[PDB]
Amino acid sequence: PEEVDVFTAPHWRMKQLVGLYCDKLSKTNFSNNNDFRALLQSLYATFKEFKMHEQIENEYIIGLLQQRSQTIYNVHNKLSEMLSLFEKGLKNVKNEYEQLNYAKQLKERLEAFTRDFLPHMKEEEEVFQPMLMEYFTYEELKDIKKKVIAQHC
């Protein structure tokens, strides 16, 4: 039921963001300083919204589900490292040799990030959403989703 689903719309926005940076990345001219900085500026804004996303889940969803089921063990950092990588590109890359070296690193890290992020969202939808249905009443889930949408939008 739509009104108790706490993941689908947030994740629709996160995957739209993934699609946009994958697009930007494949089209960026890493030899061009303006293109390079513009890309890193997008990614920084984007990964900041990813971080707001995980924090919202921690604060409004997971920390509650954890309290009631107590089947929590995997904590729900990578995002701060990605953001730190972007800051570096923005503050410490000063010519074309450094841009192109950095570019190879960025691409590898973004690829690895992207391959983990998508499954991580799938798992919340497939695992946590069902648990939420058992540990909370229907109106309780409706209330949680009201709060999660307010924080994301």
Side-chain angles (χ1 to χ4, degrees):
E2 199 140 35
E3 63 195 318
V4 294
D5 176 342
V6 306
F7 294 115
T8 302
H11 292 169
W12 169 89
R13 172 51 172 171
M14 309 311 144
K15 300 178 169 115
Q16 165 179 72
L17 285 175
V18 168
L20 289 177
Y21 76 65
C22 287
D23 214 274
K24 259 195 177 238
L25 188 70
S26 67
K27 291 181 182 165
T28 284
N29 177 359
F30 288 96
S31 309
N32 191 306
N33 183 249
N34 294 309
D35 241 18
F36 169 87
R37 293 187 61 81
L39 166 67
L40 290 189
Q41 291 177 340
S42 308
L43 288 168
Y44 197 85
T46 286
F47 278 65
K48 272 192 67 174
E49 179 152 4
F50 294 164
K51 189 200 236 206
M52 184 204 64
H53 173 65
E54 308 305 322
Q55 302 176 337
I56 284 163
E57 292 171 325
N58 285 338
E59 278 168 14
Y60 293 84
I61 299 163
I62 300 302
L64 298 203
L65 179 57
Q66 158 195 271
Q67 289 178 28
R68 285 199 194 187
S69 80
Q70 303 132 356
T71 323
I72 192 58
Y73 299 115
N74 297 327
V75 291
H76 174 290
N77 273 291
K78 198 158 178 190
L79 284 174
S80 292
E81 294 161 18
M82 292 303 298
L83 286 174
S84 275
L85 176 71
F86 304 150
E87 267 174 69
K88 269 160 282 171
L90 282 177
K91 296 193 271 168
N92 309 320
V93 164
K94 67 199 171 181
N95 64 49
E96 283 82 0
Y97 286 85
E98 298 190 337
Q99 274 160 221
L100 294 179
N101 273 306
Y102 178 91
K104 180 179 181 181
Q105 284 167 75
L106 184 63
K107 280 180 197 160
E108 297 169 356
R109 296 280 315 264
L110 275 180
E111 277 170 20
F113 179 84
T114 296
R115 270 186 266 89
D116 291 338
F117 193 29
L118 296 186
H120 158 107
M121 285 194 282
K122 184 186 166 212
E123 174 213 40
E124 306 167 330
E125 295 173 11
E126 282 173 19
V127 178
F128 295 164
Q129 172 76 45
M131 290 184 65
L132 282 163
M133 321 264 223
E134 316 176 28
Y135 285 97
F136 297 89
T137 66
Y138 187 92
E139 301 231 281
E140 266 186 327
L141 279 212
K142 285 221 327 150
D143 291 347
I144 286 158
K145 175 182 181 169
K146 161 175 176 152
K147 301 190 191 178
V148 162
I149 289 299
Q151 291 299 120
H152 284 92
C153 326

